Design an enzyme around this catalytic site. Structure first.
Site, PDB file in Angstrom:
ATOM      1  N   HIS A 121     122.231 -10.694  81.423  1.00  9.61           N
ATOM      2  CA  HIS A 121     121.128 -11.332  82.315  1.00  9.61           C
ATOM      3  C   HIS A 121     121.464 -11.690  83.651  1.00  9.61           C
ATOM      4  O   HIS A 121     120.585 -11.857  84.663  1.00  9.61           O
ATOM      5  CB  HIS A 121     120.419 -12.670  81.742  1.00  9.61           C
ATOM      6  CG  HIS A 121     119.598 -12.077  80.258  1.00  9.61           C
ATOM      7  ND1 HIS A 121     118.366 -11.868  80.370  1.00  9.61           N
ATOM      8  CD2 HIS A 121     119.996 -12.292  79.177  1.00  9.61           C
ATOM      9  CE1 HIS A 121     117.983 -11.672  79.234  1.00  9.61           C
ATOM     10  NE2 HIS A 121     118.967 -11.962  78.309  1.00  9.61           N
ATOM     11  N   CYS A 142     124.963 -12.103  74.270  1.00  7.19           N
ATOM     12  CA  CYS A 142     124.984 -11.025  75.320  1.00  7.19           C
ATOM     13  C   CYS A 142     125.050 -12.101  76.480  1.00  7.19           C
ATOM     14  O   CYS A 142     124.106 -11.956  77.773  1.00  7.19           O
ATOM     15  CB  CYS A 142     123.788 -10.408  75.279  1.00  7.19           C
ATOM     16  SG  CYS A 142     122.172 -11.178  75.454  1.00  7.19           S
ATOM     17  N   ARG A 164     121.903  -4.776  72.853  1.00  9.59           N
ATOM     18  CA  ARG A 164     121.001  -4.764  72.202  1.00  9.59           C
ATOM     19  C   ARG A 164     119.640  -3.876  72.664  1.00  9.59           C
ATOM     20  O   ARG A 164     118.610  -3.654  72.140  1.00  9.59           O
ATOM     21  CB  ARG A 164     120.246  -6.159  71.949  1.00  9.59           C
ATOM     22  CG  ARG A 164     121.429  -6.874  70.748  1.00  9.59           C
ATOM     23  CD  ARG A 164     121.169  -8.368  70.952  1.00  9.59           C
ATOM     24  NE  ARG A 164     122.089  -8.941  69.889  1.00  9.59           N
ATOM     25  CZ  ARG A 164     123.553  -9.124  70.539  1.00  9.59           C
ATOM     26  NH1 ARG A 164     123.650  -8.731  71.755  1.00  9.59           N
ATOM     27  NH2 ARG A 164     124.381  -9.399  69.532  1.00  9.59           N
ATOM     28  N   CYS A 181     117.322 -14.711  73.692  1.00  8.25           N
ATOM     29  CA  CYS A 181     116.945 -13.361  74.423  1.00  8.25           C
ATOM     30  C   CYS A 181     115.474 -13.085  74.406  1.00  8.25           C
ATOM     31  O   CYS A 181     114.731 -13.023  75.285  1.00  8.25           O
ATOM     32  CB  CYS A 181     117.841 -12.292  74.005  1.00  8.25           C
ATOM     33  SG  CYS A 181     119.360 -12.129  75.093  1.00  8.25           S
ATOM     34  N   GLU A 238     121.735 -14.510  66.449  1.00  6.18           N
ATOM     35  CA  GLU A 238     121.559 -15.465  67.558  1.00  6.18           C
ATOM     36  C   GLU A 238     120.075 -15.928  67.183  1.00  6.18           C
ATOM     37  O   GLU A 238     119.275 -15.260  67.469  1.00  6.18           O
ATOM     38  CB  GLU A 238     121.552 -14.952  68.917  1.00  6.18           C
ATOM     39  CG  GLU A 238     122.021 -15.938  69.735  1.00  6.18           C
ATOM     40  CD  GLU A 238     120.997 -16.733  70.202  1.00  6.18           C
ATOM     41  OE1 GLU A 238     119.563 -16.422  70.436  1.00  6.18           O
ATOM     42  OE2 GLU A 238     120.953 -17.904  70.364  1.00  6.18           O
ATOM     43  N   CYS A 262     118.415 -11.401  68.694  1.00  8.55           N
ATOM     44  CA  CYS A 262     118.790 -12.369  69.342  1.00  8.55           C
ATOM     45  C   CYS A 262     117.541 -12.941  69.804  1.00  8.55           C
ATOM     46  O   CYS A 262     116.844 -12.447  70.922  1.00  8.55           O
ATOM     47  CB  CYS A 262     119.532 -11.905  70.662  1.00  8.55           C
ATOM     48  SG  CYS A 262     120.072 -13.170  71.618  1.00  8.55           S
ATOM     49  N   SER A 301     115.437  -7.689  72.479  1.00 11.03           N
ATOM     50  CA  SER A 301     114.927  -8.099  71.160  1.00 11.03           C
ATOM     51  C   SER A 301     113.519  -8.513  71.346  1.00 11.03           C
ATOM     52  O   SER A 301     112.690  -8.566  70.228  1.00 11.03           O
ATOM     53  CB  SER A 301     115.967  -9.476  70.785  1.00 11.03           C
ATOM     54  OG  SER A 301     117.243  -9.235  70.464  1.00 11.03           O
ATOM     55  N   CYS A 313     121.043 -16.440  77.143  1.00 15.42           N
ATOM     56  CA  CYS A 313     121.649 -16.125  76.033  1.00 15.42           C
ATOM     57  C   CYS A 313     123.167 -15.998  76.104  1.00 15.42           C
ATOM     58  O   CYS A 313     123.510 -15.404  76.882  1.00 15.42           O
ATOM     59  CB  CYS A 313     121.238 -14.915  75.084  1.00 15.42           C
ATOM     60  SG  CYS A 313     122.022 -14.597  73.655  1.00 15.42           S
TER      61      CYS A 313
HETATM   62  N1  FCO Z   1     122.092  -7.299  74.033  1.00 16.32           N
HETATM   63  C1  FCO Z   1     121.529  -8.363  74.220  1.00 16.32           C
HETATM   64 FE1  FCO Z   1     120.340  -9.953  74.626  1.00 16.32          FE
HETATM   65  C2  FCO Z   1     119.130  -9.168  73.463  1.00 16.32           C
HETATM   66  N2  FCO Z   1     118.258  -8.923  72.701  1.00 16.32           N
HETATM   67  C3  FCO Z   1     119.767  -9.300  76.070  1.00 16.32           C
HETATM   68  O1  FCO Z   1     119.449  -8.689  77.146  1.00 16.32           O
HETATM   69  O1  PER Z   2     122.570 -11.144  72.242  1.00 16.56           O
HETATM   70  O2  PER Z   2     121.348 -10.517  72.954  1.00 16.56           O
HETATM   71 NI    NI Z   3     121.381 -12.465  73.453  1.00 14.99          NI
END
Ligand code: FCO
Ligand code: PER
Ligand code: NI
Ligand code: SF4
Ligand code: SF4
Ligand code: F3S
Ligand code: MG
Ligand code: H2S
Ligand code: H2S
Lengths: 530, 261
Positions: free
Chosen positions: A66, A62, A457, A527, A12, A524, A480, A59
């Site tokens: 969030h 995922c 992640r 993210c 991503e 990601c 990430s 994002c």
């Molecule tokens: N899994 C995921 Fe996205 C990332 N890095 C988030 O939190």
């Molecule tokens: O996809 O964090």
């Molecule tokens: Ni993500």
């Protein structure tokens, strides 16, 4: 000698890798994230209740995670205790996300680093089917593998390779060593997983309203009374069992099969510090109530697990595109963008650099599986032992790119296995006439709060400071960010930068070895930067 | 070289729009890209990387192709906020989009600017027609955050077989965006009767009363959520949550606070 891979695909977001090579091995590395959006800047001064809606858009891969972290942080700064059914519903939705996310990563984002699709045309299909039947309990026919082979053929003969255009494996590649039969099985399962993922996301949407981007959580709990009907619960259950079986019978067995041919990757991509906040709580105010446990591992040492201490987190910007060079704990986080070009003032990324007690850490499945293994989480012990016995290796093999990949499979498995527990509890509550999903709450004059989520992640945390029902500061620190952020003020490489040192490169023009290690972190960038 | 060529660009986005496309049914995504179109560029999915895929894009935009753009285009302060292979995203789109036989902006970010264009918009991000209109680009806006997969795939099919569909004032295909969510909402009977939930925990919410007083923006929102559903099973209001107007230009500022009318 410089190699640059930009864009990195099958992740991503927008990543550029720059590496230095000497003697055919990587000697230095820079992880460069190249999109900034500024969600934290946008949140300032807004209504805390709006937060989950903006931050979910950090994002769409995922998705949900969030929104969870935000309602957890606002739930927290307001002191509300959500009902058991809300806790169960939120956990169920996260379980479905783990199932969906890891399936799509393995087949559609990661596998193409290991599998030569074109070589699938050379497979003897009858032989591939027999191998398939040794690997998994479900039955495969010669005929279905012939069909897959036919489809790959139409593609190649059409001259429109599409997403396979200019693949690193076209015309052979010294780093792709799978036998044709295995390439064919992987390809067939790649196509099948495209339909399975559709069922995982549907399961999620029964509680979550829709996928991508759920819409069922609020501060104080959840809104989805409709999902409490026997019919809806039964429909979740049926999809959940299909996806689970595919994970158990196809994903995990494919993973071990392919890993077997790349056992040398057990000596590549070694890292040292690991942490997780745990996931799936019974008590929203106690990390130790979580199904997968919180814990911190220092320097590869599995005999001692420390307690996770969020007071020890600081984010650095010395090597990122922000003002100055100070580091801040997220309650005092600052987001002041300042661009200087690639390596201007030595700065090379829009990610901040999270450090735990001044040290660089890795988060995610491997980190989560290591902590749970160290703490004797029985489901994880059994899954790990199986990987280890299957590959013929000791636990030292886990600290590697191969181990990072195996651990994603285990994390997926242990989550899927527990989902049925939460579902039975929710159902039993409803049958007994207990259908509460929401708890009333009020703003303190002034407060702060934090939400911890172990996303697919890794360790995710949202941090809010509010006064009079208005956001004064809202910061995200995301998995990430930890894994792919740049150096900190102490000049320490991040997990991914460090993991790349030592990596052998067979063909500098098609550096698939770089992809293998980077993809194992499941990057990601939307993210990481937000 | 039989299937129609599609080039798919990622700009300032969360990738939720790409994910929504993966949720398509009849056709499924494998059918879409093996039998319906040829996906000649798409960063999320492609096997090669780095220079190899940039070469693929260069060749693909020499032919007859449809261009699909996900995410907003940063233009603030010169546009360096978003780069791919060293290039500002504006320059990539300016090169590719005007060459296509047709352009589709997918998702509210690409259509109107989206989440990063919300105040105070530090990257100066704008939508496709606003950025590239001077170059002759006239994109079809598939709005939503993300849109219903059927609104995107249905539009591609329509383009391939019937041509340019009729658009509303905001560039959205009237065949999908012609009525408000509210016009087709099963709770409409409650709304007209004055039967509202005043809190998420009240008996009225448990009964499925209209969510207007809890912030629902359905009455101002053009989309087909109630009749089409998402993932073939659900939609926000069915799941008890108010619509936040995600297919409307500037919804982030114009329709929040989300929980008040
Ligand atoms: N899994 C995921 Fe996205 C990332 N890095 C988030 O939190
Ligand atoms: O996809 O964090
Ligand atoms: Ni993500
Ligand atoms: S429109 Fe929404 S789902 Fe699509 S890229 Fe933008 S933020 Fe993501
Ligand atoms: S719930 Fe929303 S869309 Fe449905 S009738 Fe009420 S205001 Fe209209
Ligand atoms: S929030 Fe968006 S998904 Fe439909 S119900 Fe409202 S337009
Ligand atoms: Mg942050
Ligand atoms: S809320
Ligand atoms: S927007």
């Amino acid at each position: 000698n410089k190699i640059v891979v930009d864009p990195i695909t099958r992740i991503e977001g927008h990543l550029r890798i720059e590496v230095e090579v000497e003697g055919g091995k990587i000697k230095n590395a820079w992880s460069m994230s190249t999109l900034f959006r500024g969600l934290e800047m946008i949140l300032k001064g807004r209504d805390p209740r709006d937060a989950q809606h903006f931050t979910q858009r950090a994002c769409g891969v995922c998705t949900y995670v969030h929104a969870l972290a935000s309602v957890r942080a606002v739930d927290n700064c307001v002191g509300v205790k959500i009902p058991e059914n809300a806790t169960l519903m939120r956990n169920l939705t996260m379980g479905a996300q783990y199932m969906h996310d890891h399936l799509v990563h393995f087949y559609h984002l990661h596998a193409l680093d290991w599998v030569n699709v074109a070589n699938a045309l050379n497979a003897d299909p009858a032989k591939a089917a027999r191998l398939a039947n040794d690997l998994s309990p479900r039955k495969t026919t010669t005929e279905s593998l012939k069909a897959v082979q036919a489809k790959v053929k139409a593609l190649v003969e059409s001259g429109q390779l599409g997403i396979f255009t200019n693949a690193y494996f076209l015309g052979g590649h010294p780093a792709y060593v799978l036998p044709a039969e295995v390439d064919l099985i992987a390809t067939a399962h790649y196509l099948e997983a495209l339909r399975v993922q559709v069922k995982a996301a549907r399961a999620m949407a029964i509680f979550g309203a829709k996928n991508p981007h759920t819409q069922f959580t609020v501060v104080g709990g959840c809104t989805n009374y409709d999902s409490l009907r026997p019919e809806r619960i039964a429909e979740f259950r049926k999809l959940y069992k299909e996806v689970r079986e595919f994970i158990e019978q196809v994903y995990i067995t494919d993973l071990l099969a392919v890993a077997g041919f790349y056992k040398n990757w057990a000596g590549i991509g070694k890292t040292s510090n690991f942490l997780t906040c745990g996931e799936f709580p019974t008590d929203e105010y106690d990390l130790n109530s979580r199904y997968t446990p919180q814990g911190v591992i220092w320097g590869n040492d599995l005999s001692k697990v420390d307690d996770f201490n969020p007071d020890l987190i600081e984010e650095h910007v010395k090597y990122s595109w922000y003002e100055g060079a100070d580091a801040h704990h997220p309650y005092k986080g600052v987001t002041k963008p300042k661009w200087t070009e690639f390596h201007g003032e030595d700065r090379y990324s829009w990610m901040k650099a999270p450090r735990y007690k001044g040290e660089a850490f890795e988060v995610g499945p491997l980190a989560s599986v290591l902590v749970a293994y160290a703490k004797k989480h029985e489901p994880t012990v059994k899954a790990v032992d199986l990987v280890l016995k299957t590959l013929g290796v000791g636990p030292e093999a886990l600290f590697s790119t191969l181990g990072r990949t195996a651990a994603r499979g285990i994390q997926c498995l242990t989550a899927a296995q527990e989902v049925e527990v939460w579902l039975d509890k929710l159902e039993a509550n409803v049958k007994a006439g207990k259908d509460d999903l929401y708890t009333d709450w009020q703003y303190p004059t002034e407060s702060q709060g934090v939400g911890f989520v172990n996303a697919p992640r890794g360790m995710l945390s949202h941090w809010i400071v509010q006064r009079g029902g208005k956001i004064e500061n809202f910061q995200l620190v995301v998995p990430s960010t930890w894994n792919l952020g740049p150096r900190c003020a102490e000049g320490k490489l991040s997990a991914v930068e460090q993991a790349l040192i030592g990596t052998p490169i067979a063909d500098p023009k098609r550096p698939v070895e770089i992809l293998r290690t980077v993809h194992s972190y499941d990057p990601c960038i939307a993210c990481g930067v937000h | 070289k039989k299937r129609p060529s599609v080039v798919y660009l990622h700009n300032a986005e969360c990738t939720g729009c790409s994910e929504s496309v993966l949720r398509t049914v009849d056709p499924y995504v494998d059918e879409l890209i093996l039998d319906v179109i040829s996906m000649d560029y798409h960063e999320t999915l492609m096997a090669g990387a780095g220079h190899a895929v940039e070469e693929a894009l260069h060749e693909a935009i020499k032919g007859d192709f449809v261009c699909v753009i996900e995410g907003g285009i940063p233009m603030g302060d010169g546009g360096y906020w978003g780069k791919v292979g060293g290039r500002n995203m504006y320059d990539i789109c300016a090169e590719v989009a005007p060459k296509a036989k047709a352009v589709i902006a997918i998702g509210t970010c690409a259509t109107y600017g989206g989440v990063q264009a919300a105040k105070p918009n530090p990257t100066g991000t704008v939508g496709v027609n606003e950025a590239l209109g001077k170059l002759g680009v006239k994109a079809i806006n598939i709005a939503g955050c993300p849109p219903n997969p059927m609104n995107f795939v249905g539009t591609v099919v329509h383009l391939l077989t019937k041509g340019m569909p009729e658009l509303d004032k905001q560039g959205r295909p009237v065949m999908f965006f012609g009525e408000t969510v509210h016009d087709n909402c099963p709770r409409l009977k409650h709304f007209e009767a004055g039967e509202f939930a005043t809190s998420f925990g009240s008996p009225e919410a448990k009964k499925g009363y209209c969510l207007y007083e809890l912030g629902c923006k359905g009455p101002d929102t053009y989309n087909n959520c109630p009749k089409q559903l998402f993932n073939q099973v659900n939609w926000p209001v069915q799941a008890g949550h108010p619509c936040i107007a995600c297919s409307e230009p500037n919804f982030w500022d114009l329709y929040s606070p989300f929980y008040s009318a």
